[PDB]
């Protein structure tokens, strides 16, 4: 796997736990990369998914707090509510 | 590079890419040579091979060569002997971190994970040094406080702490320099900011002179002039 | 003795003479006094422990000689800075605003407080 | 009106000075709300 | 300690202070240092040499160099070779200090050698007789008997801890072999506390036997205070017991006091007054930011007021009740300004 | 892996240990203010109790209960809920004032034919006269509480700074005063409608104290829970650490075998 990761121009990590969580396919989107990135993405789709990453990234941080299961910052709950969707 | 350095006499800027690929290659032909590969399958001659390459790259009296060598750290484990061995031999390390990349900051370097040999106080200049000690603390304060902000809550922290966090968020996004070569990776042009200009502009931020300028008005823009311009732009 | 108390503090909870503004007019208590309940009104209160007398501005409460001759005074917050003109200016404006604007109880309070302030 | 609400309003009115203790300022400023309920069912919550 | 924390910087500071003693006539006070630069790139050692030249230290210093390029046999024999140089001094009854930096790179060279001779590589793929190798070297560091003309070869090996793992096979072995360790803490380094020493994970077995009596008196207290300060470190997360809060203040001022900017040694006759002040809690009162200003000023203040005391303290090497009395007073006077 | 999955779960456990430790220290800080308020308040309350006792303290029913919006107040929320649950078997149709969100959830479960009033924004704020007064003002009009024989308030009496005991006490109606006859060993004519004033006054005077008693217990519980958490996390840290150490040895061995095999061939 180490060798191949170097060779390849993307990695598309899947996550089994998330498969069970019901993302089926379950792409482990944090470790899912396209090394050179986007240039073969639909222009419309570039516009729309622009902050999908940002929301998700915030969601990851927010989720950690959320699983501490305490009362949440209102800003974090904007993220949380969107993030779930 | 040696021919340039020596024979042409000129200074150079060597660039090598990716030297972990050099490690992998050397590991393979070591094995093939029958020289039983050492730790984590990496050749027993790794150190001395690194040494020959690295010593060959230097500032001689014939010339001066600034190598910038890319290194791939397998699975971000720098405790692995191959990156770690290279880690010693290089003058001016930088570590590029995914999180910061994901935050959108270009460059993706985690600046609390970057150490250059030149950082000595008088060497980089006392003002520069003092500023850099302050920057490091300001960002470090935001990171340390991040756990507190996260669970205990943002507002339960001190007003002083909160101002440091606010400055850090502004500074954090003042690290964001849109890149010329990311007019294809972001569309937004580069910024070439002079050394003196950077020292001054970062100093100002720390003094809190531009805490009336939004965090996002530092995001993906250059120097103080630009920061103000984007503050005005957002205002408009 | 006197017990003059606050929720967050206590003011006196062997106070010799207390002069109290009461829903019984004004009441004075010295040692054993007749066993009473009188509501302590929003008040400027003088409490003397010995002959020395200290003057207080209080946001009212309750006053009670117990049948064991313990003057339980309970009050819930308020000085002399409070008297200081700035309050009068603010209160004059606020009283006027309340005049134009439960409203009865509020307006009664703006005037009452203006009196209560003057008492200081 | 509640007698202690009358007293309360008086305490608030006296602050119309403000040159006094911190505990008072906190004791007279509350952003707290309250949530009406009925039998489960929720008549709307409103600031206290 | 951890890689490139200026491990060499910590070491180099010792060498620099040896200039003061070197100037001094007694040849036990003349420690003829040997720095063994192992696997260190020639540019780095050139800087080292240059710095040493700047501080005019090259005339008691000896630098045995096996650079990054220098071959694994040379690297292998490099500490042994170095030790022999030390033997002339030791045999001559003089004292000297040999700093093997870093035996971790010596290990790699032996690994390369063993593997090339196809001898099986020991635990953590570092040859099995690495224990034997290091031990053979490390017991040459010895203070000879007085019939063997009271001499020594003091040594201070430097071991590079890749992830900070003292659990790593070469660190564990070496720790067993040696008599004390000083373990620099990376967090402290990052927090700019230089020296970055992890006080708990630093021990010297010889320790206070080889301590100046004056400094022993005025820093027995320091050990206990710091012990409390460590516990009360976590108390920095606040309403605290008055005793705890006092400890926290006293401890923080002490931590700053033990900062010493890299590449600037200090004289022992000036170490002892400052620590005494801290012990007497004089420094506790002084504001943290003003500790720095206080220190240099206090030293000059002492130098002006009583360099008679300083020289007396220096030369006696002990702190008498009369000196400590005068010091408490002197500190009070300085504290007032 | 084993090595990595152990380590990541162990890291989670480490981070949790740290947060609960941090919270526990901060809790001690908060506890001091809570207790301080409670002393002065309790002194005031006893004076009021002197009136009711000496008067003869002879008094559906109302239930008021208090537990903050805030959680991680240990088991205050549910221990108070348990002592409520017993008295919701003593009156399953009691009119409930819930002071703060945490008690609200638990009581809402216990009988949802009760909940009429609840108070938000409680937990965050330390007990204050403004709040007590406002809660009192809405309570008389809305809940007609005095009409229902007996009022009872539940709070947590802060027994020790390591304990919390759920407690209740009875708030006295206008009736208590009325037919208690050693009320006559206090003197007022009709120049004050002392039931109609004092009831209103003691609604707050008792309630503010009850809240202060509660708040100290609440913070005490938060400290206790957060301390025990640090310990539990520590135990788990040790268990995964030993596993980590063994796993480390196994990796070394498996690699070693590969080398041995290679050398052998």
UniProtKB/Swiss-Prot annotation, chain B:
It is found in: Mitochondrion; Mitochondrion inner membrane. It comes from the Eukaryota. The modification Phosphoserine is found at residue 101. Belongs to the ATPase alpha/beta chains family. F-type ATPases have 2 components, CF(1) - the catalytic core - and CF(0) - the membrane proton channel. CF(1) has five subunits: alpha(3), beta(3), gamma(1), delta(1), epsilon(1). CF(0) has three main subunits: a, b and c. Mitochondrial membrane ATP synthase (F(1)F(0) ATP synthase or Complex V) produces ATP from ADP in the presence of a proton gradient across the membrane which is generated by electron transport complexes of the respiratory chain. F-type ATPases consist of two structural domains, F(1) - containing the extramembraneous catalytic core, and F(0) - containing the membrane proton channel, linked together by a central stalk and a peripheral stalk. During catalysis, ATP synthesis in the catalytic domain of F(1) is coupled via a rotary mechanism of the central stalk subunits to proton translocation. Present with 164000 molecules/cell in log phase SD medium. This is ATP synthase subunit beta, mitochondrial. It comes from Saccharomyces cerevisiae (strain ATCC 204508 / S288c) (Baker's yeast). The lineage of its organism: Eukaryota, Fungi, Dikarya, Ascomycota, Saccharomycotina.
UniProtKB/Swiss-Prot annotation, chain C:
Keywords: ATP synthesis, CF(1), Hydrogen ion transport, Ion transport, Membrane, Mitochondrion, Mitochondrion inner membrane, Transit peptide, Transport. One of its GO terms (cellular component) is mitochondrial inner membrane. One of its GO terms (molecular function) is proton-transporting ATP synthase activity, rotational mechanism. One of its GO terms (biological process) is proton motive force-driven ATP synthesis. Coiled coil: none annotated. It is found in: Mitochondrion; Mitochondrion inner membrane. It comes from the Eukaryota. Mitochondrial membrane ATP synthase (F(1)F(0) ATP synthase or Complex V) produces ATP from ADP in the presence of a proton gradient across the membrane which is generated by electron transport complexes of the respiratory chain. F-type ATPases consist of two structural domains, F(1) - containing the extramembraneous catalytic core, and F(0) - containing the membrane proton channel, linked together by a central stalk and a peripheral stalk. During catalysis, ATP turnover in the catalytic domain of F(1) is coupled via a rotary mechanism of the central stalk subunits to proton translocation. F-type ATPases have 2 components, CF(1) - the catalytic core - and CF(0) - the membrane proton channel. CF(1) has five subunits: alpha(3), beta(3), gamma(1), delta(1), epsilon(1). CF(0) has three main subunits: a, b and c. Belongs to the ATPase epsilon chain family. This is ATP synthase subunit delta, mitochondrial. The gene is ATP16.
Curated annotation (Swiss-Prot), chain D:
Present with 4280 molecules/cell in log phase SD medium. It holds the Pfam family ATP-synt_Eps. Keywords: ATP synthesis, CF(1), Hydrogen ion transport, Ion transport, Membrane, Mitochondrion, Mitochondrion inner membrane, Phosphoprotein, Transport. GO terms for cellular component: mitochondrial inner membrane; mitochondrion; proton-transporting ATP synthase complex. Its main location: mitochondrion. CDD domains: F1-ATPase_epsilon. It comes from the Eukaryota. It comes from Saccharomyces cerevisiae (strain ATCC 204508 / S288c). The keyword Transport applies. GO terms for molecular function: proton-transporting ATP synthase activity, rotational mechanism. This is ATP synthase subunit epsilon, mitochondrial. Mitochondrial membrane ATP synthase (F(1)F(0) ATP synthase or Complex V) produces ATP from ADP in the presence of a proton gradient across the membrane which is generated by electron transport complexes of the respiratory chain. F-type ATPases consist of two structural domains, F(1) - containing the extramembraneous catalytic core, and F(0) - containing the membrane proton channel, linked together by a central stalk and a peripheral stalk. During catalysis, ATP synthesis in the catalytic domain of F(1) is coupled via a rotary mechanism of the central stalk subunits to proton translocation. It is found in: Mitochondrion; Mitochondrion inner membrane. The lineage of its organism: Eukaryota, Fungi, Dikarya, Ascomycota, Saccharomycotina. InterPro entries: ATP_synth_F1_esu_mt, ATP_synth_F1_esu_sf_mt.
UniProtKB/Swiss-Prot annotation, chain E:
GO terms for molecular function: ADP binding; ATP binding; proton-transporting ATP synthase activity, rotational mechanism. It is found in: Mitochondrion inner membrane. ATP binds at residues 1-8. GO terms for biological process: proton motive force-driven ATP synthesis. The chain holds residues 206 to 544 of 545 of the full protein. Keywords: ATP synthesis, ATP-binding, CF(1), Hydrogen ion transport, Ion transport, Membrane, Mitochondrion, Mitochondrion inner membrane, Nucleotide-binding, Phosphoprotein, Transit peptide, Transport. The keyword Mitochondrion applies. The lineage of its organism: Eukaryota, Fungi, Dikarya, Ascomycota, Saccharomycotina. It comes from Saccharomyces cerevisiae (strain ATCC 204508 / S288c). Belongs to the ATPase alpha/beta chains family. This is ATP synthase subunit alpha, mitochondrial. Its main location: mitochondrion. It comes from the Eukaryota. Present with 41500 molecules/cell in log phase SD medium.
